[PDB]
Amino acid sequence: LDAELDQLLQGHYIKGYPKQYTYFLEDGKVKVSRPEGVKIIPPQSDRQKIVLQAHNLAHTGREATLLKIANLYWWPNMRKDVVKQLGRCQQCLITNASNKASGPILRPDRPQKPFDKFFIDYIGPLPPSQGYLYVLVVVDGMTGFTWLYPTKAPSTSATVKSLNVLTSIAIPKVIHSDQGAAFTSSTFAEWAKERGIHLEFSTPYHPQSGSKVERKNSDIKRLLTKLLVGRPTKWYDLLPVVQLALNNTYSPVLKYTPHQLLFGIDSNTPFANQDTLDLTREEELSLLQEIRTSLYHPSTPPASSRSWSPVVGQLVQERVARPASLRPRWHKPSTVLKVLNPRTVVILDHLGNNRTVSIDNLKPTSHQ
Amino acid sequence: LDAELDQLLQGHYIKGYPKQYTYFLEDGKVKVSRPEGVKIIPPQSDRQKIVLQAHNLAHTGREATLLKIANLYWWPNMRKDVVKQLGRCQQCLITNASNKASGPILRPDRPQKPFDKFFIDYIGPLPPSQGYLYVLVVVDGMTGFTWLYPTKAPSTSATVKSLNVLTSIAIPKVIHSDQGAAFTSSTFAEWAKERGIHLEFSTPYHPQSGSKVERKNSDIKRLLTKLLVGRPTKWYDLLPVVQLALNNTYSPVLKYTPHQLLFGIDSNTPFANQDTLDLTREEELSLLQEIRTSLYHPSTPPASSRSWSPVVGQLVQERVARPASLRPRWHKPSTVLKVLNPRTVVILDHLGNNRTVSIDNLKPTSHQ
Amino acid sequence: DRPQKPFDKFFIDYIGPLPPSQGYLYVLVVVDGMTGFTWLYPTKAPSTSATVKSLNVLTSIAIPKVIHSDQGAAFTSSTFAEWAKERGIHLEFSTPYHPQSGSKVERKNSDIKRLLTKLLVGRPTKWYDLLPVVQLALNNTYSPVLKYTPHQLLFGIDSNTPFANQDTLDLTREEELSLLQEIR
Amino acid sequence: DRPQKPFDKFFIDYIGPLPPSQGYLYVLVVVDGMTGFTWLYPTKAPSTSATVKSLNVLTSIAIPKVIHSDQGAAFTSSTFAEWAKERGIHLEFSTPYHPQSGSKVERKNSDIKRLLTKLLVGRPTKWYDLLPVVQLALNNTYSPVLKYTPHQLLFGIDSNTPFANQDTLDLTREEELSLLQEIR
DNA sequence: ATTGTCATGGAATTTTGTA
DNA sequence: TACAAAATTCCATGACAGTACGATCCGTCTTGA
DNA sequence: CCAAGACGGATC
DNA sequence: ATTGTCATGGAATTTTGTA
DNA sequence: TACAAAATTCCATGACAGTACGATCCGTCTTGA
DNA sequence: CCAAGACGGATC
Lengths: 368, 368, 184, 184
Ligand SMILES: [Mg+2]
Ligand SMILES: [Mg+2]
Ligand SMILES: [Mg+2]
Ligand SMILES: [Mg+2]
Ligand SMILES: [Zn+2]
Ligand SMILES: [Zn+2]
Fold this sequence. Notes:
Four copies of one chain form a homotetramer.
Chain A: H1 3-9, E1 23-26, E2 29-33, E3 38-40, H2 44-55, H3 62-69, H4 78-86, H5 90-93, E4 101-102, E5 117-122, E6 134-140, E7 146-151, H6 156-166, E8 174-177, H7 181-184, H8 186-194, E9 198-201, H9 211-227, H10 239-247, H11 258-262, H12 281-293, E10 307-308, E11 315-318, E12 334-341, E13 344-348, E14 354-358, E15 362-364
Parallel strand pairs in A: 4-10, 5-8, 8-9
Antiparallel strand pairs in A: 1-2, 2-3, 5-6, 6-7, 11-12, 11-15, 12-13, 13-14
Helix pairs in contact in A: 2-3, 2-4, 3-4, 9-10
The complex binds magnesium ion (4 copies) and zinc ion (ZN) (2 copies).
The structure holds six DNA strands.
């Protein structure tokens, strides 16, 4: 600190400081003549304090902090001392927005058979229609067949009663849902375990994980909106009509309706398809198996130019769900324990326990 | 309708129907043998009704509606009859989402001199600090200098009292603001007209129009958040500190602070720049004029592959601001009266009057 | 001639006045013609109003071409005739005093009559909660002649809950004495 | 030697006990050393508490290197000395009974003394609302010797409201009689 | 009658010290 | 006139857009008998 | 000292 | 311990009818 | 074996993500003297 | 019949 600057003034060379420049003492402080101007060189011990003083003014990044220090001070490797202080500041790490996008979105394989994967979700608190407010939506992963159930509450008892009428048709293998209170409850967990159904849960605050039910909710709302144009919002009576409509709707990219993918033949619905009229049911079901297997699979989009991929041991920060006014929108730095896929990891959170979080609600810790 | 189908059955040729196929009458209805199967050809008068019947099932697009009709019916140019019915349906036009992105965002020229353009906006209802809830933010268009004013209400009287202390320094040419009640008021309109200041207003529900104050609000909130980590949210006393901090903050792309762009020399602020110490004030102001003129101008980004550009006479639909539950998020089709720029047009709205709306809250009317 | 398909004919019938369970007394039995798939719906009365309410939940999933039923008042009513006319369903009524459905439908209807009573003995007030597991049992019963269950004929795949072992559906010695004591 | 710059020296002074206007009685006059830019702040008392409150709004925009003031109690207080020490401002006090500021500062201070009284005659209770337009008038007054207004020296450009014509700042015949009647 | 903007921090490129 | 590394520029990225409140269940900490 | 409850937390 | 999805409607490409 | 146009495929685009409520002013429609 | 008010609308 004082020994490095003392040898520099008398002509002796130290690595970092160029020999071409003139070094002189003025006002009890070591200064250097530079093309930018006369700059003061501080001792090593004071350098840690000065960077902290210039940073804590407005809590700025690498370049904006240096430009404040460059007004008066100069030393070898200034940015290396700035970046080091940038990773130390707790206030900056949990507030600043990430400049790295998430990795390419995975497109998981469509369920092989019907009743293999069940996607369930409520469509919020709709305007009061005959006492009912909520709608439980069950979407099949394979076919895309939708069952609608009107409920007064997003409770466990309302979910059980509605699914018991549905499970009368067929028992599903795996039921996928978001981490709602009705689905994360122990009563619903013991309900599925009794019938031999595995419960699958979406990553917290990541609604696109269970997209097959979320995208269907868009088609349900869009159809209900069009049917209630210029009319009072009574949707309760329209639910059985909407259910029948969307299940018999042709998908332009799939070429088949959710009804045609589930049964094989169209019912007595308006504009029924009668192409397999000549063939027998045994031949119709054999053709149905060939259709289900030979459906298109959406290819994964190319990775963005600046995308980060999570690895084991990397420091990451979890996003705060609903941050209060003037409160940090990121949690304290946490270590990755295990990587399930390039989109989902298990991390030891701020509380101090195992938590499965998607990478969209995560950012890599800066300055490492 | 009946004459075209009668001549077709007896062997005589009509344009549209291929001569290679066999046409026969069955069950009192004209049918055709096709590779897809046996399809019924309806008369011209019934074709308009059938397309309407198949569409009103689920209110579907071009391909999804046709696939319902293709189950039973066939005629020359089916899609031309479908698209025609798609433009007639009022329910579909005001509910369906647009598949065309807006044109490339314009980057308007930075104000030439200080106090030429003033950007003002409140930062919502912040947590109660010493009775105050609102903050009036004034941003200079040229320099980026920010003046902060604590207020109890987003009212006209609160805006006038705060600006009267500011206009004591210098009178601005044009004041830009969003269409808030305090700024659109006649009392505020007569306030600016008395001092010879032109009032500029942002397009309704388009916050990025006055971005120079909106982006600065992000820097104000981010700094206030970091200063209140682990502390009760008292922001009232921190406002004069935040004001001084952000105005002396170096912009990494501009190389100069809002303070340096406004005055030319840094004050007694911590880490003050003393490069123009040798030069006189007359030489310092001459250098300041050269700096202001030679600042970077962000080039406009390339237009997207599927973008629409508004023209005079084109039918467009205005976006509903805050749509109610199960209610259309688009207004009735409206005609463009005048195009100000490739981003802003004047339209005769649903009410029946002149309205200046940005293209982001607008979509081109489908099927024209 | 076209071969038999699903949703061609729906056989509907009520089964007796069963003991009260959660307010319900009657069961609407819906049997498909080809697949033999069974739908059970709990009802309070053998009326048209209860038949319309239960079938509206069924027709929202799939609509039958023909509905078959006996000369019951709930089906032969003019209100039920207007109900089927709106959805475009032809009504077929069997001759009085002697019904006709076929060997596959009658053997399925015979199983529902005896399976419900088998589980009813000992607990007559708790048949409502068994309705889901009874529907699963019937639709996954290994067909007597054919090698396809009602689930396999309707969907094309084998069910996730296949009933491997079968009880003879017959009442045991002490179950007969308890059933003869509940009445008298 | 370095040439004179803005924010080098800030001359602060109170101007008399003016008639009550919206609760305010005193005016804190802030004059820059080089540019001659004038800041006016309404205060209720000639105290340190009122001086600190008004200067905190000014220092949030720009901080002076040296603050110059007379031997007034509001400036010579230990509380004001600690206030300037925290922000890193050196305090300079003029000799008692005879102040020293310079020709440019004293000629500017002379204009503020007479301009306020010129607009005060006829309406002594309404000087608070004139404060913004008085500040604009002083900062855009065409310099007597130099060819640059206080606005042009501070920002570098000409103001949007340039005061083209000048009244002689002198009181007219009947304005003198009204001013001599308000006191007696 | 009007219009996106800019801090951030890794990567991409240029400058620098000393041959 | 060539290195290696520091120094500087490049630039994709996200957040600013009036926000707080309710409804469900669960784990934990009460308050009278 | 314990049974029904009160309450913030987590997530939608 | 888990993961985006798909209707839409102009444009881009392929098929079709009749040489 | 080549047209022109119909028919079909391609694919960028946006919306689904628990939502309702307050605060300001303005233009318009009340309710007692 | 008119002055202070009540109320939904527009926008943030
Ligand atoms: Mg949910
Ligand atoms: Mg606002
Ligand atoms: Mg019967
Ligand atoms: Mg004094
Ligand atoms: Zn920081
Ligand atoms: Zn429609």
